Amino acid sequence: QLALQKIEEGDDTVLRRKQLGKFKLPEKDLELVLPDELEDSLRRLKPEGNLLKDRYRSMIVRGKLEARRKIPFRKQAKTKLTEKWTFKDFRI
Amino acid sequence: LSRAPKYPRKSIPHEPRLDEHKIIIHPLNTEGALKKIEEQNTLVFIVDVKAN
């Protein structure tokens, strides 16, 4: 029974549970034209998705780099303002 | 910065000091070694004093 229990391309839509980087990758956005938005010409086609985001997701999924979040503001060096000696010693 | 010398200080790398022909000198032909040959499946050699 133990032996039979031991005996018994990748898809980017179903990812593994463990993260690579600061967070697990979110589910992809819905790339589907709804029936109310269907058009009959190439000119009126509304393209779906984001190809730059697709390339970034492809590189993260294939493991060339890890998923990181943007840091909009970094911590500043803690400083203290003081008046210069020449401006302190100015007399009039 | 790590060193980036403009010339090597030694032109030719020296060979291995202790190769196999210097490690093994000659087998021992004494009667104790000759006993060990069939009693212990053991060969006795005289080797270089620096070899481990």
Binding site: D29, L30, L34, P35, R43, K46, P47, N50 | -
Partner: protein
């Protein structure tokens, strides 16, 4: 639970997240005297222009005199050239030529080519629908905003702008002012330096395309 409105709600939330992600000091007496002499020179020049009394031009707002007279300020109001590195398309008439001659010290203008017009509209193209800045990501926006004029695609918009058609005013009003980049920002020793230096007044003719290629 209707799956059609569920998928529509999920799509609306996803595109909402997508557009959210994509979106006193002491004054010197020499400064006072310099500002007066600048204003007297500008007054003399404007008085001379007023006493003296169809191509396509591209106009870029550049840094000039800090204090602007009310008539050049109003001309910049109608030409939508408030911020630095804002670019607009202008049809050359007599009135527009007079306006360009008035606001010459604050603009850099010339004749754009087909490559410049095409690259500007394709890479930095925004339309003004509902008073909002909407990127030209599809022909549907152009069809519902300018379809009464026969303009149903980006190429129709480019054709109207480049050939200066009957609806050039509508096309240029639909187009938001272009926000051009500063190439000096990529190099740290010249990080604060403005790209276009004032002084080269007048028409640059076809040499505006070098600036458009560098900044677009």
């Amino acid at each position: 639970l209707v799956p059609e409105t569920l998928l529509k709600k999920r799509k609306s939330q996803e595109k909402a997240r997508a557009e959210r992600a994509a979106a006193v000091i002491f004054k010197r007496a020499e400064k006072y005297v310099k500002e007066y002499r600048e204003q007297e020179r500008e007054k003399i020049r404007l008085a001379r222009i007023a006493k003296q009394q169809a191509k396509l031009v591209f106009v870029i707002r550049i840094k000039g005199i800090n204090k602007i007279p009310p008539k050049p300020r109003k001309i910049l109001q109608l030409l939508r050239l408030r911020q630095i590195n804002n670019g607009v398309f202008v049809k050359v008439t007599k009135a527009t030529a007079e306006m360009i001659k008035i606001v010459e010290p604050w603009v850099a203008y010339g004749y754009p080519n087909l490559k410049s017009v095409r690259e500007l509209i394709y890479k930095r193209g925004y339309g003004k629908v509902n008073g909002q800045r909407i990127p030209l990501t599809d022909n549907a926006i152009i069809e519902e905003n300018l379809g009464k004029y026969g303009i149903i695609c980006i190429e129709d918009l480019i054709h109207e702008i480049f050939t200066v058609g009957p609806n050039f005013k509508q096309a240029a009003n639909f187009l938001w002012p272009f926000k051009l980049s500063n190439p000096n920002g990529g190099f740290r020793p010249r990080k604060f330096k403005h790209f276009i230096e004032g002084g080269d007044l007048g028409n640059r003719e076809e040499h505006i395309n070098a600036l458009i290629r560098a900044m677009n």
